[PDB]
Amino acid sequence: DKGKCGLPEIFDPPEELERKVWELARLVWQSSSVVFHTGAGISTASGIPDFRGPHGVWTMEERGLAPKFDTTFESARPTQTHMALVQLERVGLLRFLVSQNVDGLHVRSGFPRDKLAELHGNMFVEECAKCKTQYVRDTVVGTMGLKATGRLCTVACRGELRDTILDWEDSLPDRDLALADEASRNADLSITLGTSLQIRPSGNLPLATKRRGGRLVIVNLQPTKHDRHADLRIHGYVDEVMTRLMKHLGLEIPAWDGPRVLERALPPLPRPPTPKLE
Numbered sequence: 234d235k236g237k238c239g240l241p242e243i244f245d246p247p248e249e250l251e252r253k254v255w256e257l258a259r260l261v262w263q264s265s266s267v268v269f270h271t272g273a274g275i276s277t278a279s280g281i282p283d284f285r286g287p288h289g290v291w292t293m294e295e296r297g298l299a300p301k302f303d304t305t306f307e308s309a310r311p312t313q314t315h316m317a318l319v320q321l322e323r324v325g326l327l328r329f330l331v332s333q334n335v336d337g338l339h340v341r342s343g344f345p346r347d348k349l350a351e352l353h354g355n356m357f358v359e360e361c362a363k364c365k366t367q368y369v370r371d372t373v374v375g376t377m378g379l380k381a382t383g384r385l386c387t388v389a390c391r392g393e394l395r396d397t398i399l400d401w402e403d404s405l406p407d408r409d410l411a412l413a414d415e416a417s418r419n420a421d422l423s424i425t426l427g428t429s430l431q432i433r434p435s436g437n438l439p440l441a442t443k444r445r446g447g448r449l450v451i452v453n454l455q456p457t458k459h460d461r462h463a464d465l466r467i468h469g470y471v472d473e474v475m476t477r478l479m480k481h482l483g484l485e486i487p488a489w490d491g492p493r494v495l496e497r498a499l500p501p502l503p504r505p506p507t508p509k510l511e
């Protein structure tokens with residue numbers, strides 16, 4: 234299944250967008266455990282196509298056209314949204330990040346790997362079949378569907394290194410899915426950014442938050458499978474939403490100094506005091 238492709242994009246008019254991003258700031262300020270869920274829509278503003286948008290991989294395949302890239306994976310820069318998520322984690326306003334993206338931009342943005350579940354894998358990550366050690370490379374490993382890459386493990390092993398890109402049939406990495414599930418169940422606030430939530434089980438994790446009494450925010454230009462469950466629904470460009478959110482929180486979007494891998498989150502930095510809400 235390729236799900237429902239080419240659904241129309243909706244745009245909240247300016248006054249409604251500004252009110253909703255203020256509401257998003259309120260939910261972030263008032264929640265103790267925030268989880269973000271990202272899909273291909275947070276990388277479109279860096280020149281990587283989505284799957285089901287108007288120019289998505291599947292949408293364009295139906296017209297017998299190839300998807301259009303404005304960059305390579307290697308030369309892609311993290312978006313304002315990617316860098317906003319880095320800062321929210323650094324000041325302790327983001328507990329966990331669940332991504333369906335294989336574009337490798339969360340990792341290369343400097344987002345700590347111990348707070349990231351990459352449910353569908355990472356173009357730049359190969360894993361040793363023998364000892365399960367991961368290598369984050371500066372270039373895409375070159376295979377998809379958990380095939381041998383031609384390189385061997387160098388741990389003090391010679392194990393066969395395979396890509397981490399799931400094929401259609403393949404089940405999700407157990408560690409990442411277990412952590413994504415635990416994080417989603419424990420969150421009082423799940424925020425989805427640039428995902429249609431059409432792929433199971435990735436797309437249902439934000440519901441785990443709702444089922445347990447937490448709130449759900451969906452940010453997406455197209456409608457999503459779970460629109461009916463959202464406490465707040467924002468139809469706008471994620472970069473515009475996240476830059477306005479960061480201005481309300483009084484946080485800067487940090488500079489990206491090129492590809493940087495952070496295995497373990499650093500201690501939390503200071504953040505502005507919270508406004509008096511109502």
Ligand SMILES: Nc1ncnc2c1ncn2[C@@H]1O[C@H](COP(=O)(O)OP(=O)(O)OC[C@H]2O[C@H](O)[C@H](O)[C@@H]2O)[C@@H](O)[C@H]1O
Pocket residue numbers: 242271272273274275277278283284285286289333334335353427428429430431432452453454455456469470471472
């Ligand atoms: N800048 C933007 N701002 C907001 N929404 C956007 C933007 N750009 C696109 N969108 C929306 O972003 C949404 C992107 O939805 P989909 O294309 O389904 O991507 P996924 O990540 O959820 O696909 C999941 C898996 O499916 C595959 O099989 C792979 O395994 C993927 O991991 C659309 O609804 C766009 O309207």
Ligand SMILES: Cc1cc(F)c(Br)cc1NS(=O)(=O)c1ccc(NS(=O)(=O)c2cc(Cl)cc(Cl)c2)cc1C(=O)O
Pocket residue numbers: 273281282283284290300335336377398399400401
């Ligand atoms: C490889 C890739 C991953 C992405 F996330 C995005 Br966007 C784009 C690409 N490149 S692509 O043109 O769209 C592209 C798309 C599909 C395939 N093969 S596939 O069986 O249909 C497939 C790939 C992936 Cl990552 C996930 C699934 Cl669920 C299925 C190859 C390429 C290519 O590059 O040769």
Ligand SMILES: [Zn+2]
Pocket residue numbers: 361362363364365366386387388390391392
């Ligand atoms: Zn090994």
